[PDB]
Coordinates of C-alpha atoms (C1' of nucleotides) and ligand atoms in Angstrom, one line a residue:
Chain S
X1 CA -26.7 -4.1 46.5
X2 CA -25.9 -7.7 47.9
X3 CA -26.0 -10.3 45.3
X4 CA -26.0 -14.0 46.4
X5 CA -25.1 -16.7 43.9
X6 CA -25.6 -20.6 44.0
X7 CA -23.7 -23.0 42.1
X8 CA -24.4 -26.9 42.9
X9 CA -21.0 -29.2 43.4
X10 CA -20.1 -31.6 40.5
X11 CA -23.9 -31.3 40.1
X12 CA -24.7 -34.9 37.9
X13 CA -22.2 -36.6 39.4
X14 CA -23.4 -35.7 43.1
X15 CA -26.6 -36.1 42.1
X16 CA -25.7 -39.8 40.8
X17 CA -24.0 -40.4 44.7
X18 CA -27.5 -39.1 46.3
X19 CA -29.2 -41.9 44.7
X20 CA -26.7 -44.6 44.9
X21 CA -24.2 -43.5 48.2
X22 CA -22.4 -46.5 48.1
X23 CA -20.4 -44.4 44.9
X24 CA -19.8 -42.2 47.7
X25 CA -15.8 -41.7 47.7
X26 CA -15.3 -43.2 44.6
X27 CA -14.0 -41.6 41.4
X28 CA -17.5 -41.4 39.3
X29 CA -18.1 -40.5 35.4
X30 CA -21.4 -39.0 33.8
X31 CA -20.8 -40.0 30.6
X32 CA -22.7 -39.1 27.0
X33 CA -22.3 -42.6 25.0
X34 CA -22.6 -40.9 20.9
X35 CA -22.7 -44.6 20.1
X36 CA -20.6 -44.1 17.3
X37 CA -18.2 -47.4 18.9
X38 CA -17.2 -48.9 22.3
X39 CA -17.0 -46.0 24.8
X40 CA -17.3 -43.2 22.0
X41 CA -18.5 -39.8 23.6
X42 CA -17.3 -37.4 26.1
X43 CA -17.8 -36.9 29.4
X44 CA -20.6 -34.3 30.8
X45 CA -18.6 -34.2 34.3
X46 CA -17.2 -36.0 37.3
X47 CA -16.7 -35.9 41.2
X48 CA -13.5 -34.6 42.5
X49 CA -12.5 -37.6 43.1
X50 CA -12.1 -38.4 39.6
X51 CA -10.9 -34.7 38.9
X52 CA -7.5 -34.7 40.7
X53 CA -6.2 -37.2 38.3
X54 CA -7.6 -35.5 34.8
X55 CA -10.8 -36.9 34.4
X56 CA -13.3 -33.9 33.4
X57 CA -16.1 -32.5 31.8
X58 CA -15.2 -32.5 28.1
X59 CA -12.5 -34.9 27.6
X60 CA -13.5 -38.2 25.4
X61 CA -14.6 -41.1 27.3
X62 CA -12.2 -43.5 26.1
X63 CA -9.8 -41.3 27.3
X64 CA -11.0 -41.0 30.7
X65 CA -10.8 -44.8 31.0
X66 CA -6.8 -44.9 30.1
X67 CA -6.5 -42.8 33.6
X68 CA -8.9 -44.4 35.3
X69 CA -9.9 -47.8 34.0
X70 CA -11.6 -48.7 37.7
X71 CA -14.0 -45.7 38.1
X72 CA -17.7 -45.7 37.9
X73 CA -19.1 -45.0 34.4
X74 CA -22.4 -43.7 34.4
X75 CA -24.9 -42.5 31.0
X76 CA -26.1 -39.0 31.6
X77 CA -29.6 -38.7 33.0
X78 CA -30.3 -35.4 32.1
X79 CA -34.5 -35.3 33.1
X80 CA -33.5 -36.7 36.8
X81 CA -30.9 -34.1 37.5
X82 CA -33.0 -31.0 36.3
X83 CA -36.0 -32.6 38.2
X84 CA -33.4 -32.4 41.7
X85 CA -32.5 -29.0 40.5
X86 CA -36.2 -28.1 40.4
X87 CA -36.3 -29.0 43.7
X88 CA -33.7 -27.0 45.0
X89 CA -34.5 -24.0 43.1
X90 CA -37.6 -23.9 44.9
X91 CA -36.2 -24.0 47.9
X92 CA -33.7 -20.9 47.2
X93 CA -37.5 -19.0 46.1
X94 CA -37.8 -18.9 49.6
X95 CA -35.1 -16.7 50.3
X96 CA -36.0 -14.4 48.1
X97 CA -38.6 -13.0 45.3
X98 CA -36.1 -11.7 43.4
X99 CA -34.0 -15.0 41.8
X100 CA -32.8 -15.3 38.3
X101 CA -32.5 -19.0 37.2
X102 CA -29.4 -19.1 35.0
X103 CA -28.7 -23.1 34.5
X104 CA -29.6 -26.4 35.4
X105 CA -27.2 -26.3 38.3
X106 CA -26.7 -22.1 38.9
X107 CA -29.0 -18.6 40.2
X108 CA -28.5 -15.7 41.2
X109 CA -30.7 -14.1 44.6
X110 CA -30.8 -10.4 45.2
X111 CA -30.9 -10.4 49.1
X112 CA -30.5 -6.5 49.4
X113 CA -33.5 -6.2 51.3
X114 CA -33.4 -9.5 53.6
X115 CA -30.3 -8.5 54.4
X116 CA -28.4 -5.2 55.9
X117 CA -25.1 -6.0 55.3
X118 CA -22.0 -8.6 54.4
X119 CA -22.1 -10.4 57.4
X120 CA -25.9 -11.5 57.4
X121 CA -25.1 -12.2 53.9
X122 CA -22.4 -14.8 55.1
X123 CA -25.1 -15.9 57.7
X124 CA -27.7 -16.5 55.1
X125 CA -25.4 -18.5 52.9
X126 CA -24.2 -20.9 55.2
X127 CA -28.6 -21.1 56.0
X128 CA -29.2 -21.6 52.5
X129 CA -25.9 -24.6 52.5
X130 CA -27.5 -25.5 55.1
X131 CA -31.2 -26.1 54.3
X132 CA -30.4 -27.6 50.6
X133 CA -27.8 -30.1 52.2
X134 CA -30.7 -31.5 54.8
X135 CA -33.2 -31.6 52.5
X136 CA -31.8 -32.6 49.2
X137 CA -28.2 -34.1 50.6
X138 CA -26.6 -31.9 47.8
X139 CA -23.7 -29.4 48.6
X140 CA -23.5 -26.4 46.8
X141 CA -20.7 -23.3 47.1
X142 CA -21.8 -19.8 47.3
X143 CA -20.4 -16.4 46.0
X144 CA -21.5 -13.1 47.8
X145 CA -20.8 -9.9 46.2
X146 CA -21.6 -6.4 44.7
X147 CA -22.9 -8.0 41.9
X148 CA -23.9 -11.1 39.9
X149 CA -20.4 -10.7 38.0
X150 CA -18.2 -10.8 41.3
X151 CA -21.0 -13.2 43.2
X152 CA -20.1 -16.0 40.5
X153 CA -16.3 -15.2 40.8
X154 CA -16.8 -15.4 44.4
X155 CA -18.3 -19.3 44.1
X156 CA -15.2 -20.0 41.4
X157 CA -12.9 -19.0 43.8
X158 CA -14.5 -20.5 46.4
X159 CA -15.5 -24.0 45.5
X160 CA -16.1 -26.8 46.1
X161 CA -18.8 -26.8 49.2
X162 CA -17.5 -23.4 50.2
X163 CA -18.6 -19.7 50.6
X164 CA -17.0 -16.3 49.9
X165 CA -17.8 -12.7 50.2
X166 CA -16.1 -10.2 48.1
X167 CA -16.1 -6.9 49.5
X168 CA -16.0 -3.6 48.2
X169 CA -12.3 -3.2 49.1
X170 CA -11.7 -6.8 47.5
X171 CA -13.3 -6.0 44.3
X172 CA -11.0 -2.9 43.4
X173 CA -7.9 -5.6 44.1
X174 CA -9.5 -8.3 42.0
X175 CA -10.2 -5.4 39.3
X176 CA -6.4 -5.0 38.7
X177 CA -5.5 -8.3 40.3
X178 CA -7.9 -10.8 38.4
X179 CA -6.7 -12.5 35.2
X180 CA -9.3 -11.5 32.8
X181 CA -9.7 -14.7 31.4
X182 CA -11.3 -15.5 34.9
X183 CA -14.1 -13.0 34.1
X184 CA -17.2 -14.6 33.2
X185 CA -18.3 -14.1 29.2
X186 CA -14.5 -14.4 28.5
X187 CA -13.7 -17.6 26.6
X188 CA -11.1 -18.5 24.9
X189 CA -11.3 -16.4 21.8
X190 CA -12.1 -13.5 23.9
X191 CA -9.2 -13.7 26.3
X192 CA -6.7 -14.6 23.1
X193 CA -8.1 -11.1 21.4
X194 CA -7.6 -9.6 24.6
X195 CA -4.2 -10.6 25.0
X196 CA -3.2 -9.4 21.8
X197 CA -4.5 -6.1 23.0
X198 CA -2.1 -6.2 25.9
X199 CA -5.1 -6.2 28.4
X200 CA -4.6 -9.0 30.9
X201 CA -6.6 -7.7 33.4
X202 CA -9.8 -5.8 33.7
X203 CA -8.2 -2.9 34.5
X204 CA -5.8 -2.7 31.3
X205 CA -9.4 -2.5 29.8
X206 CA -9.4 1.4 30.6
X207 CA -5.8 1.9 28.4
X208 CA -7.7 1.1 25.3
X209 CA -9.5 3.9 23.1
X210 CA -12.9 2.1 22.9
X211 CA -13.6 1.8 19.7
X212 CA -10.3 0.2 19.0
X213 CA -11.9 -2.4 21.5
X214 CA -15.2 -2.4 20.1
X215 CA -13.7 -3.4 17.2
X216 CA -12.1 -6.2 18.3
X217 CA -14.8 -8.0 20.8
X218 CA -17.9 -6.1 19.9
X219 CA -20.2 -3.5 21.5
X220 CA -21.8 -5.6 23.8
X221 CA -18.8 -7.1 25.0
X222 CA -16.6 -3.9 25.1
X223 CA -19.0 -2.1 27.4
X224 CA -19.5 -4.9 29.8
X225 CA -15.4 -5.1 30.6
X226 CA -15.5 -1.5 31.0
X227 CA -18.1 -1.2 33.5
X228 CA -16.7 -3.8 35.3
X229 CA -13.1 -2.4 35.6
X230 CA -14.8 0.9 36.3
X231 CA -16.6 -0.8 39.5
X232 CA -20.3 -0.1 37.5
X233 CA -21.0 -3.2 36.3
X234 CA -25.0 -3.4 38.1
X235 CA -27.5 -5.7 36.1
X236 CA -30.3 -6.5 37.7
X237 CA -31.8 -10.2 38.9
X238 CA -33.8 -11.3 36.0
X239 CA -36.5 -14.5 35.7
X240 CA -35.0 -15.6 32.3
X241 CA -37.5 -17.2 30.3
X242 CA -37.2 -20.6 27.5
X243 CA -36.9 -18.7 24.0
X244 CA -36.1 -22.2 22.4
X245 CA -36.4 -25.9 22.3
X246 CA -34.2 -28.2 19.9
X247 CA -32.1 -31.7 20.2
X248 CA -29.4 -32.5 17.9
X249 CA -28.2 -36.1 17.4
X250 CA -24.7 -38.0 16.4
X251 CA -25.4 -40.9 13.4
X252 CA -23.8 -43.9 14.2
X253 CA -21.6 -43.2 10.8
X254 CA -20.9 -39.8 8.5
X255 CA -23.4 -39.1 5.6
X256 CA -24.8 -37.1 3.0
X257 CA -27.7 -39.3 2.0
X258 CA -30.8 -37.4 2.5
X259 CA -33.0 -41.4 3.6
X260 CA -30.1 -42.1 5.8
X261 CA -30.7 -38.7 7.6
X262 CA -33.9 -38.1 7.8
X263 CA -34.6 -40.7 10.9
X264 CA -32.2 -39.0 13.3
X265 CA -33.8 -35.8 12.3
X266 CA -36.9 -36.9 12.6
X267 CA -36.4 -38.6 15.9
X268 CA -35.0 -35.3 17.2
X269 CA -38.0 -33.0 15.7
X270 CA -40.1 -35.7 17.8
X271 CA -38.1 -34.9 20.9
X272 CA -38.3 -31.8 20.5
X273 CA -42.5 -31.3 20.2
X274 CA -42.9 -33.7 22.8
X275 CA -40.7 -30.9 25.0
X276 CA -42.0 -28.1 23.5
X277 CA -45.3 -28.8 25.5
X278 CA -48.3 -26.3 24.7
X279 CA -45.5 -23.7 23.3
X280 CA -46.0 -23.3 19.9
X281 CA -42.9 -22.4 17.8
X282 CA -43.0 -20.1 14.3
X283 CA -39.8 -20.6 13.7
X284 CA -37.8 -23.8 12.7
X285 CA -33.7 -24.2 12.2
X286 CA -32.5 -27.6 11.2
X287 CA -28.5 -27.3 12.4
X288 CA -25.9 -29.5 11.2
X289 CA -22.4 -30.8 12.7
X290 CA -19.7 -31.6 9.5
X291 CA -17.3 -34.1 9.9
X292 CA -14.8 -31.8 11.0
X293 CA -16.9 -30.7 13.6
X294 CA -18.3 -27.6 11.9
X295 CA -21.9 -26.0 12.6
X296 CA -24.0 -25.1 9.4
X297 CA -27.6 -24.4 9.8
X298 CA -30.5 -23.5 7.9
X299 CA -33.9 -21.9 9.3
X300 CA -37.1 -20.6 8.6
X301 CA -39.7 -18.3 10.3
X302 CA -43.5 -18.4 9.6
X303 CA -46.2 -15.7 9.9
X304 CA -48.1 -18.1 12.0
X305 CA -47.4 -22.1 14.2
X306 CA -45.8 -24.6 12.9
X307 CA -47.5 -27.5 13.4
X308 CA -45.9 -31.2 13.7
X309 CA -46.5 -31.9 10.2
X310 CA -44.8 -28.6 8.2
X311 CA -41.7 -29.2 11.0
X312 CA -41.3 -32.7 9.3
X313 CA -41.8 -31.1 6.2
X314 CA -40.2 -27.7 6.1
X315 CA -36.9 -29.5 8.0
X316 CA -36.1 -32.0 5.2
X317 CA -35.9 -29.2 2.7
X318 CA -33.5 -27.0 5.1
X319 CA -31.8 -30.1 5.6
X320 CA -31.1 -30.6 1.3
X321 CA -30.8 -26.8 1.5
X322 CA -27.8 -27.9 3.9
X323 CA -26.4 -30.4 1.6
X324 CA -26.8 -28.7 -1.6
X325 CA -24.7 -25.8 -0.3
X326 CA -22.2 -27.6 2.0
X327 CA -20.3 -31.0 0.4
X328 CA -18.9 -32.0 3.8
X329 CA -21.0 -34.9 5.2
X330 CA -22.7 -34.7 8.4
X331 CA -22.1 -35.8 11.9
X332 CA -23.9 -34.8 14.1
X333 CA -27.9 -33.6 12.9
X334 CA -31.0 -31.9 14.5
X335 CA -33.2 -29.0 14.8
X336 CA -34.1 -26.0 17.1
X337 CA -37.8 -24.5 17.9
X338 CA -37.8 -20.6 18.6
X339 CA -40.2 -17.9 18.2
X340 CA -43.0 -19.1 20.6
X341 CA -46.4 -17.4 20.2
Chain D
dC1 C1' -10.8 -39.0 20.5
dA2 C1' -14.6 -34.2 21.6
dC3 C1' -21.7 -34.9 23.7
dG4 C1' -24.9 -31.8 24.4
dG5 C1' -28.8 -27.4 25.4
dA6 C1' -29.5 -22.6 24.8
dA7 C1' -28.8 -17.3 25.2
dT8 C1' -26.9 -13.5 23.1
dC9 C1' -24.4 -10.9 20.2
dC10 C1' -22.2 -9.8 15.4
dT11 C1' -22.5 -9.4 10.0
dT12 C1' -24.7 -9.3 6.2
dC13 C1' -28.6 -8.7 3.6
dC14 C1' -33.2 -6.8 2.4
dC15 C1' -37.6 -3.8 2.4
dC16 C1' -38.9 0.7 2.7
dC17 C1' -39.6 5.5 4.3
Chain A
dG1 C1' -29.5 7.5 6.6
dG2 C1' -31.8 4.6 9.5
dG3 C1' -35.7 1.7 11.7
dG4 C1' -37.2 -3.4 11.6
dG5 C1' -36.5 -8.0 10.8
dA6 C1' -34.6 -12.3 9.3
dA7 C1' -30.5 -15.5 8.4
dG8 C1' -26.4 -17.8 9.3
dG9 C1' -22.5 -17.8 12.2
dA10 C1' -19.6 -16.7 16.4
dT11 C1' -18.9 -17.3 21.3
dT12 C1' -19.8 -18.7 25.9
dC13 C1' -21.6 -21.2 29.8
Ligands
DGT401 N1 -23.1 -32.9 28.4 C1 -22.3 -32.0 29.0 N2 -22.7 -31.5 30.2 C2 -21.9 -30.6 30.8 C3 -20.6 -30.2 30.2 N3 -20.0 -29.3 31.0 C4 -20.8 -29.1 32.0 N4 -22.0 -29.9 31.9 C5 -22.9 -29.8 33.0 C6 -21.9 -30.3 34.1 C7 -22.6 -30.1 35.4 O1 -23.4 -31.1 35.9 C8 -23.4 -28.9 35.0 C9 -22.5 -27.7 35.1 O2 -21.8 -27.2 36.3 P1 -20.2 -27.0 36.0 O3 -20.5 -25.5 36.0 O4 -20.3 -27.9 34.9 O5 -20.1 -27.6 37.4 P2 -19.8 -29.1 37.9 O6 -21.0 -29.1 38.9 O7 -19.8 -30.3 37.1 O8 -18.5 -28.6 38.6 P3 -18.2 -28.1 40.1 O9 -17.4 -29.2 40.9 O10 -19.5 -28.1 40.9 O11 -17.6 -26.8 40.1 O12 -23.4 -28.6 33.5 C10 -20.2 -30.7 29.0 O13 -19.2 -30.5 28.4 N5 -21.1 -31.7 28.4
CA402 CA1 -21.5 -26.5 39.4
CA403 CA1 -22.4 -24.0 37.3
CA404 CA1 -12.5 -18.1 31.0

DNA sequence: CACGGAATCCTTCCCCC
DNA sequence: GGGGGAAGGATTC
């Protein structure tokens, strides 16, 4: 089983360079503008160049520009970025039937048949680097393993514009060598609860009874550290399909009046229909950020559609459903379509 | 000072054999 | 007791 993943370098900000070179070398900034005052958002990433001095995906804007007042600041355009990635996914279709999807910027290609063995795998990566860089001019780092767990270490460790195979051999190192918190699926709360369990690395994960670690990170999660640390960890390549559609906006200011709302909200439920294109939702959640950053959210499912005019509807009474039950005012407001027929 | 989309999994109900 | 779902929240990428 050879799995081959792809993850895209400083995606929006390369893809920024592409159509504007001359940036090229320079420290650039995809920023998200929340418009709540000058330079008031975060930042949705960066090249490298802007990297090695702090500036990355997460941190406020305004902060960004105390380190580096003389970069290039750039708004987000999120519809030209997933229309390059489009591209390149296509191209990586062609390497393989078998190709699960799993971001704007990452997939996964099961290559066990095109290929016999590690070193082809190489081969076919550097092909693959290859071929997107020509076509598309984007560089991209590739992990090569066992399995799509290890793959996607292999492109962490790896990166950027690089390629890495993990063997057999190396995975058993990497099982009791490998901070845990470096496993993919482990946040921070994860790795914290993990900690206090005095398992730092996967293999610390086999000292624990289970359901002592069941219940502290859940089922799910329990059995998916123990297959890995056990060297059994093999899910298959899967084409993951849209389950939902939603947009959620910041107000210029904090409210709790339901008139001064209901535009953002409604401006998002329009956003959101217009995306949802011929999918049909039944089920509508209108989801709320507090002023102390908290998520509330209120939804309902329906036996049948929901068409345009119950979302308007049904939403403003989730959203004084929201208010009624929370006193906090709102920040940040919009709404999520799931359940398509 | 901290935007934004979405999948999945966890708890707590609740209806009903 | 447990199958079947729905809600609201937790967690991660
Ligand atoms: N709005 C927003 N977008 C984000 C955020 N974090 C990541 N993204 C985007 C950034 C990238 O263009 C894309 C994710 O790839 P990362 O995995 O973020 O890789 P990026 O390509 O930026 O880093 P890299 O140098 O390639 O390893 O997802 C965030 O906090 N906010
Ligand atoms: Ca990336
Ligand atoms: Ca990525
Ligand atoms: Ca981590």
């Amino acid at each position: 089983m050879i799995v081959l993943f792809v993850d895209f370098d400083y995606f929006y900000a390369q893809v920024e360079e592409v159509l504007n070179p001359s940036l090229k070398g320079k420290p650039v900034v995809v920023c998200v503008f929340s418009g709540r005052f000058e330079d008031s958002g975060a930042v949705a990433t960066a090249n490298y160049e802007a990297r090695k001095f702090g500036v990355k995906a997460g941190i406020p804007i305004v902060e960004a520009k105390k380190i580096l007042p003389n970069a290039v600041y750039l708004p987000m355009r999120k519809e030209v970025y997933q229309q390059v990635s489009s591209r390149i996914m296509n191209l990586l279709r062609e390497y393989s039937e078998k190709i699960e999807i799993a971001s704007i910027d990452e997939a996964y290609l099961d290559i066990s048949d095109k290929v016999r063995d590690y070193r082809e795998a190489y081969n076919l990566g550097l092909e693959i680097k290859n071929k997107i860089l020509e076509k598309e001019k984007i560089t991209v780092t590739v992990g090569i393993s066992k399995n799509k767990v290890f793959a996607k270490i292999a492109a962490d460790m790896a990166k950027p514009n690089g390629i890495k195979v993990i063997d057999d051999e190396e995975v058993k190192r990497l099982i009791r060598e490998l901070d845990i918190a470096d496993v993919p699926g482990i946040g921070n709360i994860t790795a914290e609860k993990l900690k206090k369990l005095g398992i730092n690395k996967l293999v610390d994960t086999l000292s624990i009874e289970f359901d002592k670690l069941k219940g502290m990170i859940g089922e799910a999660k329990a059995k998916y550290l123990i297959s890995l640390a056990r060297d059994e960890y093999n899910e298959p390549i899967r084409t993951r399909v849209r389950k939902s559609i939603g947009r959620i906006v910041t107000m210029k200011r904090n409210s709790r009046n339901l008139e001064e709302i209901k535009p953002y909200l409604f401006r998002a439920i329009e956003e959101s229909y217009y995306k949802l294109d011929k999918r049909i939702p039944k089920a509508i959640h209108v989801v709320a950020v507090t002023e102390d950053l908290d998520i509330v959210s209120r939804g309902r499912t329906f036996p049948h559609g929901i068409s345009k005019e119950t979302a308007y509807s049904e939403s403003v009474k989730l959203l004084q459903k929201i208010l009624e039950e929370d006193e906090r005012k709102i920040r940040r407001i919009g709404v999520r379509f799931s359940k398509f027929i």
